[PDB]
Design a protein around this nucleic acid. Structure first.
Ligand SMILES: [Mg+2]
Ligand SMILES: [Mg+2]
Lengths: 446, 296, 446, 296
DNA sequence: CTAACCGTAGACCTA
DNA sequence: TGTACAGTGACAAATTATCTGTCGTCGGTG
DNA sequence: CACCGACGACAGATAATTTGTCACTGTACAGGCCCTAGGTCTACGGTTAG
DNA sequence: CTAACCGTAGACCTA
DNA sequence: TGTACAGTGACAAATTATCTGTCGTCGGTG
DNA sequence: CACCGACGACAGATAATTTGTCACTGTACAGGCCCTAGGTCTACGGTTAG
């Protein structure tokens, strides 16, 4: 586990020396050899002694001995040991915590100390810049290492618990997150509304987009449920969208792998998961799921940056014209996004491997033909309150309202479960426990 | 006057058509050989697609110098027993003399082919003068001829001994093998690679993982490899005026069978076309133009 | 107004040609000359005809004729004129307004057009990158020109009106602005308060700091008045500030040159200006007054970035530790700022010229010894309401309160002017018009 | 055999002490002269602080070649009437022959000083063998001697004519002046400057403003100037293998009297010296240490 | 006088 | 002619590890 | 015994390396990230029944 | 029925 | 082994302005 | 009249320049700037006096 330094290409002086050496390595009559030495000295024009060291030198170091030996004091400092360590220590403390230290400020601190110690010759500022150089430098690579990612066809992701979850087939693991769209919108009158949220559901195995929604509602369990609803049911669009291909994806995941923000660890989502039969998992760190996040950059690069009202990734680059130029409505932008996703994005070649389009990776990879879930079986995405008590006369207490309907009076005093739509609570679906089963009783009206 | 006194190199275009792994037609290959002039015995070879200009012979020489150690797959019966430096090495006309010099023998500048033609090549599939033959197969055939026939033949100039036997007979001394690392002035190089976190490198769309390479995540290194087998690559650190050997790295995610450089390029160029195929018909173009029209 | 191309240093081939030429320029026996030509051809190893062009060539172009003539097609494009103009036009439109276009996207548009036109050979993406190159490039210099500034000892500034105002002596023109301090503060209990505003008054002639204040009150006419009060009266500090030098500046400006934000074009400031006798002027653009703004960067670089709780300078560089590390109070930070200004900043050498410290530039440059303005004559910084009417019985209407005091009853029905302190309105100073003079009558109590 | 047939250059250290504008002592200067060997007449001179190594003679030659045109300040009575290329130019040992070549005369490699010693230098203030003498004053004295005495003297080798008169007498033809720009292969250069908005450049802490330079705000240019007078600088654009003259720029904010390069450096180092004296004996160091202690 | 009970509101955490 | 401090090329001076002679000594050879 | 090659003790000369000095130029100062919308989890004055 | 009058509040601009 | 698209070195192929011969013609000279 | 130097009409060879192809690598995706505190300027339901 060592050795083998192999010399770099030799320059002209060394080339001449090489030839001289080739002539002197070979033994012959001693006197003739002596003549060769004289000849060697004239070819080099140095001395009759020198060429003995030059050959001997070659004898041990080959081509390397013909390179220029470095001064071997390289990298050393000529200042006192105390000062070199003083500078290094000062700097390390200078940047500890939230504060920042500049090399120039360090040099001043050094000067101040030099005074205290009565040292007439502390290092100059230029020297401090040189002493800290390697420290400032390593950092520049340290913050910029490029991970290899995965080589393809095989992958897994970690959970907060440290569990490894495989991704073996289409609709095995789905992921979801939220971002903002970097476009300002206007209404039908030209009045500006703040940019909308974009929520995506992505199929981990194929990297095909499963369903999206965008609009002005802040992230919530409600938003997630709406996003899932789109990702789960069969899709269809009208002729106004000017589509060439159909967006063909639907099904149900086994795992829901997403972030740890409250929108995803809610009782509402848990109820959804229990009723649909899938399990939630949380990321260990932002760098752990990159496939979910990534596509947001390609939307900025291929679509949104070409639209009027585009802002920017950061406020450092926000175009000054960004607030005045917007003319698009939410309806128009959504149409654009759908056509983009359907006839371009899901039509591209998988980046990891081969000649499969994203859409095709997904279809070839799905074990069975999915059975559409009836739209009416998505009522499970409605919220369930774990309890209200039915009052005498058959009315039940809810959100500052009483509800009544068929049966209820005969069940007064019972504790019941209420399924309702957060968007419209005109009626409520009432369930009761029968052998620990949740069984429907009635639909009550406000 | 004795075995390994003088070596002579030779080169030709080989007029056998090769066909690739996907049935695609390749251009004709070059062959370079190194021979010991005392008994006319073949020391080492190099078969590939590159012209015997500057390169190739450097690798053929290395092949001649180092022990041979061929695998079961070549179905050899006889041992190819040569190794070791000559006193003089003649090649057909700087770096060639630097190799001589760093190793210990004199380099000079300025015909086995007659027998390869008659006894092997003119009889093979694809002979240019319909059928398929890969480069790996051809090289197996070539070495089988050289180790078990040519060097085992008694020449008309001797009659008593085979070309190898006379080679043996003429050795004035027992040659001693040179540690291989001493030969790292021949292997082909890539000039720059960056170490990826964890200690990994990319070469020809394969990933390699090094031993103790991890401490250098983020620094530039350069590397050397034998085109006949790129599963392990030699990594060097760049010092002023010197490539200082750092470590070895192994290919990962590939098949068990040892991979050659020509084979890697072929797989990669097989994907590019596969990508160039689907494209976008009306699709993309239509979307872009419509996007612009709707915006206006 | 032309000519004079003078060649660059010649390479080795040309050097040889030069010598050949030196021999052939000189005439001699025709036959001998002929011999020289033959000799010239052998030295160059070319032809007997070549060296006639080489000399002739030298005859017109001197050393330049010995350089390699460029291909002269350099910079040209081999593609059709239609496409080159198409690419340039597309790009210019692609970035008009708030949107952004990438060269990649342009190349695609080109391809789309190529299809429409049935052109089998449009330029490749790599070509588009090359065609737009000079356009992307000019911009990089255009956004980065460094202004020369002024050469020293002479200066003037423009107003919005286009008027040139000279700066001739100390306390001729003062400037003032507002920034934030990039340090979070805590109270005496460790609880975090948002970073404070810093307001400065700077002497334009000397660039010495005239007075500062910092704290949590948002910019207002009130803040400005407080800032001026400090800049105008003689300064003094206690021993707890651990000062070596006294901060010696005071006086009154003639011009108040500042920004156009509302804090500075208020009736309150106008009243101050009228009573103290100085005139306000507004900047034409942020780049017009740089001397007022500038010093804020040096505070970040020499002082604030070394303190705990430092919050960078943007949102891109904000240290993650910035919110937790703060431990300084407003009182402590102010003490630090004062010692910094007094024994370091105003002690530095003027940047424009010489060996004068900032403090000295100011003192040597002040025409007369200032007379301190009595502290009691700063009551003029109190606000004046142009009118309230005195009610029968002698009470006057104010801010939802009535005030009364000596005299007022005998003046009922009169319109009067009210001077009051926005911070404490317990009493009011009442003035009336006497021959268009504002004359004090009384001090009224709530 | 005729006037301007052969020119000869010569150089020495001049043992006169010079003192600067602020009374500071300077080291001894170099003098280089160019002489016409037909009548021993002085063609041009160069007085300064740089060694006659590579440079200086290039400027002395230019001085010899170009018309002289001296001002009222030198109090000259006689006209220094020479200008023009010789057939041969001898200097004391590439770029020197490139100058010859671009201009038209042959360059060769290999004693007025005897008379400067006796008739001027040994008699001046500061003679090293207490008193003050600036460089500008010395050069005025030197040219006064050369134009009105040396070249006006009749030599012992002639008796009939003065050194200049014989020079005149020996001209086979009327020399014709060469446009000055043709001499821009001698002037000293700075390698890079950036054009500031509006068309301005900095050189030696002076600002210069160019004619039509404004269109290049932001680009790199390089520049040439005569050390004896830096009030106008020649700006060149950098083309592949050529410096192509772009424009002229004039100094601004300086005094009316023409400024030389040595004088600019002197003013600037005096300003630096002054800055290095105020200091922070305790004012800054104390504050820094206290800042740290209070933070802790 | 004493105990049980759904709707507002506050403390806290996270994207 | 917007502004002033931190960082950076280009070069001179001081210190030193290393190369070069000249000679002496030991070993191999005639 | 004498001549030539290899090695060393020693002194002296020499470029390589580091340190210090000086003039020319890039870039932030120009109101600005701690705030906001969810969710869980729990406390609770008021209300009602015994 | 009719006219005059200080304190809240809304529209708008800027750093 | 987080991710996948825009931008970039290194090199081969096609097109062309420009350099090189060989010869013919005109002018200067012997 | 014959020999040598300068110029040109012409064809042919040749590197310079541009264009196209392919493999290796930097960097944003990771909730996030339209909101906020002043001031001027004016409208105004309610209140009060005639
Ligand atoms: Mg999230
Ligand atoms: Mg402002």
């Amino acid at each position: 586990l060592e050795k083998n330094v192999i010399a770099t290409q030799l320059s002209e002086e060394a080339q001449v020396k090489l030839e001289v050496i080739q002539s002197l390595l070979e033994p012959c009559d001693r006197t003739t050899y002596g003549q060769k030495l004289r000849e060697a000295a004239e070819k080099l024009n140095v001395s009759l002694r020198t060429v003995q060291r030059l050959v001997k030198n070659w004898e041990q170091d080959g081509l390397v001995g013909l390179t220029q030996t470095s001064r071997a004091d390289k990298g050393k400092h000529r200042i006192g040991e105390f000062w070199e360590n003083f500078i290094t220590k000062t700097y390390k403390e200078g940047n500890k915590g939230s504060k920042r230290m500049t090399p120039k400020q360090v040099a001043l601190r050094v000067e101040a100390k030099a005074r205290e110690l009565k040292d007439s010759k502390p290092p100059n500022y230029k020297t401090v810049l040189r002493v800290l150089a390697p420290i400032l430098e390593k950092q520049q690579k340290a913050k910029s290492i490029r991970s290899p990612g995965w080589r393809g066809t095989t992958l897994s992701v970690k959970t907060r618990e440290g569990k490894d979850l495989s991704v073996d087939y289409s609709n095995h693991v789905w992921q979801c997150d939220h971002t903002r769209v970097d476009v300002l919108l206007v209404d039908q009158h030209g009045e500006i509304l703040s940019r909308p949220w974009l929520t995506t559901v992505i199929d981990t195995y194929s990297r095909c987009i499963m369903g999206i929604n965008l609009g002005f509602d802040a992230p919530s369990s409600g938003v997630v449920a709406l996003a899932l609803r789109h990702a789960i049911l069969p899709k269809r669009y009208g002729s106004e969208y000017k589509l060439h291909c159909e967006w063909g994806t639907y099904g149900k995941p086994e795992h829901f792998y997403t972030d740890g923000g409250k929108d995803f660890r809610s009782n509402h989502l848990s109820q959804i998961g229990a009723q649909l039969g899938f399990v939630c998992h949380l990321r260990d760190r932002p760098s752990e799921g990159g496939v979910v996040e990534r596509p947001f950059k390609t939307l900025n690069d291929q679509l949104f940056s070409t639209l009027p009202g585009y802002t920017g990734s950061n406020v450092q680059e926000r175009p000054e014209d960004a607030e005045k130029d917007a003319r698009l409505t939410l309806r128009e932008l959504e149409q654009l996004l759908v056509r983009y996703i359907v006839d371009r994005y899901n039509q591209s070649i998988d980046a990891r491997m081969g000649d499969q389009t994203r859409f095709e990776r997904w279809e070839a990879g799905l074990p069975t033909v999915p059975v559409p879930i009836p739209e009416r079986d998505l009522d499970i995405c409605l919220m369930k309150q774990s309890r209200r008590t039915v009052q005498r006369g058959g009315c039940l207490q809810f959100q500052n309202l009483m509800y009544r309907g068929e049966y209820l009076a005969g069940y007064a005093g019972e504790t019941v479960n209420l399924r309702f739509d957060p968007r419209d609570i005109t009626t409520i679906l009432v369930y009761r426990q029968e052998n620990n089963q949740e069984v429907f009783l009635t639909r009550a009206h406000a | 006057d004795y075995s390994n006194h003088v070596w002579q190199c030779d080169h030709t275009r080989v007029d056998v058509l090769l066909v690739d792994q996907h049935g695609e037609i390749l251009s004709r290959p070059w062959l370079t050989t190194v021979i010991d002039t005392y008994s006319r015995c073949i020391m080492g070879i190099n078969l590939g697609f590159d012209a015997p200009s500057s390169g190739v012979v450097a690798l053929a020489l290395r092949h001649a110098i180092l022990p041979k150690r061929y695998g079961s797959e070549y179905k050899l019966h006889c041992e190819w027993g040569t190794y070791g430096k000559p006193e003089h090495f003649y090649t057909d006309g700087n770096h060639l003399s630097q190799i001589g010099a760093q190793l210990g023998f004199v380099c000079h500048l300025r015909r086995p082919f007659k027998t390869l033609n008659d006894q092997l090549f003119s009889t093979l599939p694809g002979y240019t003068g319909d059928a398929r033959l890969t480069l790996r197969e051809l090289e197996q055939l070539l070495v089988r001829y050289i180790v078990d026939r040519y060097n085992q033949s008694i020449d008309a100039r001797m009659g008593d001994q085979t070309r190898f036997e006379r080679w043996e007979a003429g050795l004035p001394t027992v040659p001693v093998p040179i540690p291989e690392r001493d030969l790292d002035i021949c292997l082909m190089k890539q000039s720059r690679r960056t170490v990826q976190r964890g200690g990994c490198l990319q070469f020809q769309n394969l990933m390699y993982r090094g031993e103790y390479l991890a401490g250098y995540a983020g620094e530039t290194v350069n590397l050397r490899f034998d085109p006949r087998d790129i599963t392990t690559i030699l990594v060097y650190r760049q010092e002023n005026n010197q490539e200082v050997f750092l470590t070895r790295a192994h290919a990962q995610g590939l098949e068990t069978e040892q991979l050659a450089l020509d084979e890697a390029e072929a797989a990669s160029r097989r994907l590019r076309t596969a990508g160039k195929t689907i494209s976008n018909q009306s699709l993309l173009q239509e979307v872009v133009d419509r996007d612009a029209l709707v915006a206006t």
